[PDB]
Amino acid sequence: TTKMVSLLNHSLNVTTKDGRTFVGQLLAFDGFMNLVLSDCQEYRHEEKRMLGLVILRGEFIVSLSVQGPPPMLLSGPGVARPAGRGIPLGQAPVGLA
Amino acid sequence: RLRTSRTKRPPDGFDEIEPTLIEFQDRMRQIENTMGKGTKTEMLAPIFQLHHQRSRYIYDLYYKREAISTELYNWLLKQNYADGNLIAKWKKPGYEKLCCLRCIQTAESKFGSTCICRVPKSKLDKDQRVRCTHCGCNGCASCD
Amino acid sequence: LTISDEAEKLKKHLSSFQIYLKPKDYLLDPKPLLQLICASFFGFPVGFV
Amino acid sequence: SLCIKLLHETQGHIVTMELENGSTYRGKLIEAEDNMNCQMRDISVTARDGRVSHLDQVYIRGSHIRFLIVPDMLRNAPMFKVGPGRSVPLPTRGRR
Amino acid sequence: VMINTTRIIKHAILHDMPIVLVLNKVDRLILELRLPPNDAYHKLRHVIDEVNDNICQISKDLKYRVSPELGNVCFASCDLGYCFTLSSFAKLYIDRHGG
Amino acid sequence: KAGAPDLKKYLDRQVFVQLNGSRKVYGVLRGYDIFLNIVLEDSIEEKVDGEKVKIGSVAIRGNSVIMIETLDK
Amino acid sequence: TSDLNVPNLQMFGHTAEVLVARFDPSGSYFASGGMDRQILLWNVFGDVKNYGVLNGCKGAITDLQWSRDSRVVYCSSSDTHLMSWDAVSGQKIRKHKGHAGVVNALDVLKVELLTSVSDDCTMKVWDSRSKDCIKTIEEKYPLTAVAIAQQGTQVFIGGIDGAIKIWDLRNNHCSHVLKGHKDIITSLAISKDGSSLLSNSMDNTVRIFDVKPFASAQRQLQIFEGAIHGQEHNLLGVAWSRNSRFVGAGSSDKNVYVWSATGDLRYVLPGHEGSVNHVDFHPHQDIILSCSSDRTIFLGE
Amino acid sequence: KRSGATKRAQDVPLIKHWYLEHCPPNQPVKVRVSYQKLLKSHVMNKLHMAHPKSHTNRSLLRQLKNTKFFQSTSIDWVEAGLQVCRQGYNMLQLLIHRKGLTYLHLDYNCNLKPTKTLTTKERKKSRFGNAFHLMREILRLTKLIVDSHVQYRLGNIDAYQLADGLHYIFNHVGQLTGMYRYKYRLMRQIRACKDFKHLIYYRFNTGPVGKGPGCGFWAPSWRVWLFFLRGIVPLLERWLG
Amino acid sequence: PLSQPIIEPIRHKRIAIETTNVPDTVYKKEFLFGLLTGTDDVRSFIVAGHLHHGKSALLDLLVYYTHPDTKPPKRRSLRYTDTHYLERERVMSIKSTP
Amino acid sequence: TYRRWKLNLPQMANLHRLGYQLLSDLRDDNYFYLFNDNSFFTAKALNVAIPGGPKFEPLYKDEAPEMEDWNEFNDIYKLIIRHPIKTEYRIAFPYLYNSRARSVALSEYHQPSNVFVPPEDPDLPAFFWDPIINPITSRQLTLH
RNA sequence: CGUCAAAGCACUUUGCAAAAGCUAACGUAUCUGUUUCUUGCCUUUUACCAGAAACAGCCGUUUGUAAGGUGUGCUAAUUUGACUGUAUAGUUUUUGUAAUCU
Numbered sequence A: 001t002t003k004m005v006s007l008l009n010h011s012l013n014v015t016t017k018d019g020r021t022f023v024g025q026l027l028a029f030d031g032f033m034n035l036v037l038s039d040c041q042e043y044r045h046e047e048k049r050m051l052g053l054v055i056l057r058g059e060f061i062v063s064l065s066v067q068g069p070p071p072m073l074l075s076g077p078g079v080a081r082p083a084g085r086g087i088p089l090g091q092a093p094v095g096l097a
Numbered sequence B: 001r002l003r004t005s006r007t008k009r010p011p012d013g014f015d016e017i018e019p020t021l022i023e024f025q026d027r028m029r030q031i032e033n034t035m036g037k038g039t040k041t042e043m044l045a046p047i048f049q050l051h052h053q054r055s056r057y058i059y060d061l062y063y064k065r066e067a068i069s070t071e072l073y074n075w076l077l078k079q080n081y082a083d084g085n086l087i088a089k090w091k092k093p094g095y096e097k098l099c100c101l102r103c104i105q106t107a108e109s110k111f112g113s114t115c116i117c118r119v120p121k122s123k124l125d126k127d128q129r130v131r132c133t134h135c136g137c138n139g140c141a142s143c144d
Numbered sequence C: 001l002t003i004s005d006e007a008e009k010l011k012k013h014l015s016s017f018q019i020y021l022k023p024k025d026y027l028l029d030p031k032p033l034l035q036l037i038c039a040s041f042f043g044f045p046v047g048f049v
Numbered sequence D: 001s002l003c004i005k006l007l008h009e010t011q012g013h014i015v016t017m018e019l020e021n022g023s024t025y026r027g028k029l030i031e032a033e034d035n036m037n038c039q040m041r042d043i044s045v046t047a048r049d050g051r052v053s054h055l056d057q058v059y060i061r062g063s064h065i066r067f068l069i070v071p072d073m074l075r076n077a078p079m080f081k082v083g084p085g086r087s088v089p090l091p092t093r094g095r096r
Numbered sequence E: 001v002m003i004n005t006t007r008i009i010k011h012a013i014l015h016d017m018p019i020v021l022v023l024n025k026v027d028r029l030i031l032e033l034r035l036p037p038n039d040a041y042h043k044l045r046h047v048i049d050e051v052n053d054n055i056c057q058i059s060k061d062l063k064y065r066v067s068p069e070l071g072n073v074c075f076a077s078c079d080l081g082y083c084f085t086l087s088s089f090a091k092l093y094i095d096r097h098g099g
Numbered sequence F: 001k002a003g004a005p006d007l008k009k010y011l012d013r014q015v016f017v018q019l020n021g022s023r024k025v026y027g028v029l030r031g032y033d034i035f036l037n038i039v040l041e042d043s044i045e046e047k048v049d050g051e052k053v054k055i056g057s058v059a060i061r062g063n064s065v066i067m068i069e070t071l072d073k
Numbered sequence G: 001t002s003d004l005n006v007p008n009l010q011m012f013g014h015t016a017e018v019l020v021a022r023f024d025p026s027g028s029y030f031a032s033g034g035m036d037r038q039i040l041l042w043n044v045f046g047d048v049k050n051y052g053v054l055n056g057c058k059g060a061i062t063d064l065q066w067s068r069d070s071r072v073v074y075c076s077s078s079d080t081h082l083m084s085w086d087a088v089s090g091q092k093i094r095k096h097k098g099h100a101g102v103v104n105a106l107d108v109l110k111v112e113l114l115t116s117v118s119d120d121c122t123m124k125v126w127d128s129r130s131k132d133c134i135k136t137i138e139e140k141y142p143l144t145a146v147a148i149a150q151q152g153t154q155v156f157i158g159g160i161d162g163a164i165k166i167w168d169l170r171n172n173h174c175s176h177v178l179k180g181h182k183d184i185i186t187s188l189a190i191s192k193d194g195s196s197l198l199s200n201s202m203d204n205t206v207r208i209f210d211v212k213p214f215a216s217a218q219r220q221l222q223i224f225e226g227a228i229h230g231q232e233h234n235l236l237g238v239a240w241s242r243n244s245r246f247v248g249a250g251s252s253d254k255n256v257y258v259w260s261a262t263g264d265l266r267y268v269l270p271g272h273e274g275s276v277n278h279v280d281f282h283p284h285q286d287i288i289l290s291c292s293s294d295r296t297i298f299l300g301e
Numbered sequence H: 001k002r003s004g005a006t007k008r009a010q011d012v013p014l015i016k017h018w019y020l021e022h023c024p025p026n027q028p029v030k031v032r033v034s035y036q037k038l039l040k041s042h043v044m045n046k047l048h049m050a051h052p053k054s055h056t057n058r059s060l061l062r063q064l065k066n067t068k069f070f071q072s073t074s075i076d077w078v079e080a081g082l083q084v085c086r087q088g089y090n091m092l093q094l095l096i097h098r099k100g101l102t103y104l105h106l107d108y109n110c111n112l113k114p115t116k117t118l119t120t121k122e123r124k125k126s127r128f129g130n131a132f133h134l135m136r137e138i139l140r141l142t143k144l145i146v147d148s149h150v151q152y153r154l155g156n157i158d159a160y161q162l163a164d165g166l167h168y169i170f171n172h173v174g175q176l177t178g179m180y181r182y183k184y185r186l187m188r189q190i191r192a193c194k195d196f197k198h199l200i201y202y203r204f205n206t207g208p209v210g211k212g213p214g215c216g217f218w219a220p221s222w223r224v225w226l227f228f229l230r231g232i233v234p235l236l237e238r239w240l241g
Numbered sequence I: 001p002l003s004q005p006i007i008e009p010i011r012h013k014r015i016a017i018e019t020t021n022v023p024d025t026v027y028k029k030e031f032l033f034g035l036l037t038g039t040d041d042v043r044s045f046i047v048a049g050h051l052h053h054g055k056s057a058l059l060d061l062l063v064y065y066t067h068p069d070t071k072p073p074k075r076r077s078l079r080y081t082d083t084h085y086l087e088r089e090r091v092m093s094i095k096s097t098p
Numbered sequence J: 001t002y003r004r005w006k007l008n009l010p011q012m013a014n015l016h017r018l019g020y021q022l023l024s025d026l027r028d029d030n031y032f033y034l035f036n037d038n039s040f041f042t043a044k045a046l047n048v049a050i051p052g053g054p055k056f057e058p059l060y061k062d063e064a065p066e067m068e069d070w071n072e073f074n075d076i077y078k079l080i081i082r083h084p085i086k087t088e089y090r091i092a093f094p095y096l097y098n099s100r101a102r103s104v105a106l107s108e109y110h111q112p113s114n115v116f117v118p119p120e121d122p123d124l125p126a127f128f129w130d131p132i133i134n135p136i137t138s139r140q141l142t143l144h
Numbered sequence K: 001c002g003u004c005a006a007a008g009c010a011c012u013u014u015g016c017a018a019a020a021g022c023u024a025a026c027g028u029a030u031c032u033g034u035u036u037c038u039u040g041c042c043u044u045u046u047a048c049c050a051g052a053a054a055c056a057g058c059c060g061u062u063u064g065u066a067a068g069g070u071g072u073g074c075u076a077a078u079u080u081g082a083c084u085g086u087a088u089a090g091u092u093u094u095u096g097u098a099a100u101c102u
């Protein structure tokens, strides 16, 4: 049931045993998957009804699906300074002399 | 370290090896008294010698002849009869015959390098096979 | 049980209530251990409310 | 459980709920249980067809509930973490 | 019950104020006084009776009567962090052991 | 586990019970169980037409109880 | 000849030799890392100051690669690991394990695919979330540098043998070798379009090869002399310009080398205090980045 | 408690509650005054309590151990004490000989006595300062303590005699060293040791146990001298430097 | 007098305990405002009794639960709702802090 | 490193038994009423001295008659003498019983009295009615 | 106790950094010094006497972090953190009062 927790705050549409559909934002679920939906709209065959905060029973629920993503360094020791390149008179690798 | 007559009795396997440890202690005392014939650091070389030898004796007791119980061996290390760090070095590959522990650490050298004794003789020239100044060591490397 | 230093018996009794403590918790001072046990056993003071 | 906690939160407000019949009830919630049995006052029942009646005191059994329309300002009710043994979602101060 | 408690009770009943009694520092009966459970119950009962007497000295109405069976008295140990009643502890039995 | 329903205030009062299938029974509540099984005495049944028959002592299974109603002010 | 405040800018930081410093694909940011087990993030334009450090790595940053999103950073460590650092928050995302030696090189794909080689004579390709090597290729001698084609089926791995191996991830047929080198290949870099490969080897010759399915024999285009490698056996980098007409390299002779892709030496500019591990060009302007084993990184034109 | 943090051995007073409480009745005047003076010192300490200031952890011993000129080992305490006494004596001898002051004799008990009658020139040249004399007297006290322990180790005295001797040493620094001359603020510590002696004595010699030698409860005086040394160490190091 | 400074030092007279910013709680402040404004869930009462019988500890019991940030002090009780340096000195409530 | 300890209950009980001569027997803290640190700070500030406690320097020497006047405020003419104002009052209530009250410090007013008496003999049960406690008989009440 | 996650773990050495924010024991302990004032004893200086203010030093403590050491392991051990964590076909949710038409 860990996956079910991942659906918190997502927007959900739930088909019911009646056949209606509630769409809204999930607030909290249950062991019997009682759902709490905020800002809920009703889909009665399509007719629109504002419901608001709605608690669905576990038995009433048939299926559910998501419709939207959930609403959503300190420092370092580095310091820069301009400088030029100094040409050496040698042509040899560092190890070899 | 020092044990009284009323102290807790050492484990069972101690008494048969007690006399030779006593001999080690006796000669350590003699080396303390013995003076002369060396520079400021050469006179202190035989100390490490005997110390390594004593620790090697205990190491030989456990790991090569299993003549002592594990309880007695932990007791011996806890009573400083052996150097735990030196034995730990002896238990890893490349340091089977380590002389002492000052010839492995690089913070005590001028140029941040180990001692000459740690170096295999095959890559060392014939002329520079000299006695270590730290402990008189004549070759630590496991190859030799 | 909390005071009298009975770790195993107290642990078993709390396990029966599904109250689970970390092993380092039984080795606490008597008074903070009492507070921890009482806060796990009797949660929010809902009786007063 | 958080859902029954919210249902308990609702008591004293006006909540609308519909049962397995299809009738919707509009009244003041006065009691609630873990089974979601509800006690109501001043109910205005709207039947499935549309007939409107009135009731004074009812004790609706929980098993015959489809959903409830909780008042909106309970959206900010706190959802507390529930341990294994705890049966009521409450603020915690012990281990968990 | 002390002198200021008596004054508070008198002024509250004189002003028609419901009173909820919290019997604090219960843990001192167990850890300090070391009373046996029965004598601890007697001590609690005596304190409640003293509060009820102080109430009755003003108005003998039954509306102002504090006693645990009315849910009007809470046993608390705020240092150890608990404050229960008869009904709260009873519920804490019921949730564990059924219906 | 289970839980006892709160019905002490409903005891020994004239009550109306709505069962499943559009039933309806009067009566005085006399007892209840964990599963809301209720017991009624000297009760009266309503039919769809509307005439009341004396139905008597009744022991309703709690599974079928839709609502329990009192009428007093 | 750019938007830089100064023609030449010295960057001071780090507590040991810096081994890699790579530009953001957008050309707005870049990071650096080395033997100090630390990653420093910088700002290309403005005051050029640090805005974050990436602590937690338990080893030297042998190589690192920016992500196309410019939001996550992948770092290769000498301690047989491959960490994924979130640039904008600085927390551990994931640590990919499975190698058996020092992870030498790293490369990223146009698709979240990572590739790497290590001294255990293996090559491993990683998904950004799999946390495990989905494909593994075993060789006989340790591998030193990788290049992944942006199209996503051919990988070029250069190692001790002095011959570049081309591996087809799907085909697993390897009977096609880009012979021509004679010593250790320090670095490989693919052209922007995906047609030419830049190779640097310890045999002192920087060579350029073509990356096409079809060839007219002797796939070797041309070689460049001068870039010499010291006795420290360092991993010297090579870079492809944004227009892929100037090829760059670093040499252990304190020289930064830029060639015109036609065999004519263009830049010989000195300026480093030690062996220069990495060199890179800006994808928008004519900036050249230097990274030497002297705790310093140079800006360019 | 049942859980703590292992305070240092000298951070445990063990008799603080004796004078933090009231004085027992029917005591001589000196005991009452001792109680009052110790309470005064405690109150003065508590009044000027400063919240500790933040600072990074630094320690001389770790810095010295980092160098190659210092080594480490484990030895008996009496051996370490003998070594410290001998080293201090050698150091004091080497400064009395790099001055040409070879006619002055520093005996093994740390007394500077000339070996011959001195002219005015020698007497003015051989005048040392407060730093040298203070350090010499501290060294003399240390040698007294280590010599007591050595006597106990030889079997010349038993444990009870050793404890009594140590208590006497710590209570009678002003009569055994003469260190007070070169730093007179030691008199506070001397007064404190006398006060502690009074408390312990009048709580020790009660009943069957009477007057005489034997009281060896030397922890309070010992920690008093430790806390004097804590403050005098930086001053002496600066002066000797 | 010599005591009067020429340049007065910057003095901020703090008398009570007061958190500069509102500490977090287990609930939301808007929720509490909704209960106070649009609900009958508000109870107004006083906590009274004798001296040192534990009435401030009763409120500390609730503060420990609603305010997770607060922690018990080292050597005494929290004594929330004291908020006066004088009361913290005498270790007893002198004012009626709501 | 020997930096933290955890002891059992029998061990702590036995240590408490062994070192029983060197620990207080108060467990109340009401014993130090006017003889604790804050009272001493107040006494030092006011220059008074409780006859069992320390004596300090005045800390405030500014009491010269610079005003040269009695201010007709503290004069006997208009003052009711009932009981002398002892210094215990001036230390207990520093801000009421004396003017010129600067640098004084306030102390804890009261503590709940401890009612724990340790058992005399272990054979008795831990929970036992002590005869010193008065019996609970209060048939002097008029309840509802 | 259980599940998930990442961290080798236990002990220990050294370096760096920090330690009141909401009135409160970094240390339930306790020394020394400087400057500016006021005192005590005083033939002058150090050395002193005892109170205050402002400053410092020393003996110590805690935490974070980095690199190592010893002993055991990676063919497993321990620690840390998080968790909406448990049964159950027999009325109150998950082993169907369903289909049938309208």
Ligand SMILES: O=P(O)(O)O[C@H]1[C@@H](OP(=O)(O)O)[C@@H](OP(=O)(O)O)[C@@H](OP(=O)(O)O)[C@@H](OP(=O)(O)O)[C@H]1OP(=O)(O)O
Pocket: H171, H194, H197, H201, H205, H211, H212, H213
């Ligand atoms: O110096 P005081 O504190 O006054 O104590 C001295 C004396 O000390 P001196 O030897 O320094 O004079 C003894 O004390 P210790 O020498 O033993 O410390 C002795 O103590 P005991 O009798 O306990 O051995 C006794 O003190 P008291 O008489 O209080 O026991 C005596 O005191 P008087 O000076 O009063 O004779």
Ligand SMILES: Nc1nc2c(ncn2[C@@H]2O[C@H](COP(=O)(O)OP(=O)(O)OP(=O)(O)O)[C@@H](O)[C@H]2O)c(=O)[nH]1
Pocket: E024, E025, E026, E027, E028, E076, E077, E078, E079, E080, I049, I050, I051, I052, I053, I054, I055, I056, I057, I058, I077, I079, I091, I092, I093, I094, J112
């Ligand atoms: N043993 C024990 N002590 C308690 C308990 N509750 C409070 N105390 C102690 O009671 C003392 C006073 O606590 P406070 O909360 O200040 O009591 P108060 O009534 O607010 O005091 P005032 O405000 O002056 O009247 C403190 O020592 C608390 O630790 C308890 O439940 N058990």
Ligand SMILES: [Mg+2]
Pocket: I055, I056, I092, I093
């Ligand atoms: Mg209060």
Ligand SMILES: [Mg+2]
Pocket: none
């Ligand atoms: Mg003169």
Ligand SMILES: [Zn+2]
Pocket: B098, B099, B100, B103, B115, B117, B118, B132, B137, B138, B139, B140
């Ligand atoms: Zn050697």
Ligand SMILES: [Zn+2]
Pocket: B099, B100, B101, B102, B103, B132, B134, B135, B137
């Ligand atoms: Zn050696």
Ligand SMILES: [Zn+2]
Pocket: B099, B103, B115, B116, B117, B118, B132, B133, B134, B135, B137
């Ligand atoms: Zn050597």
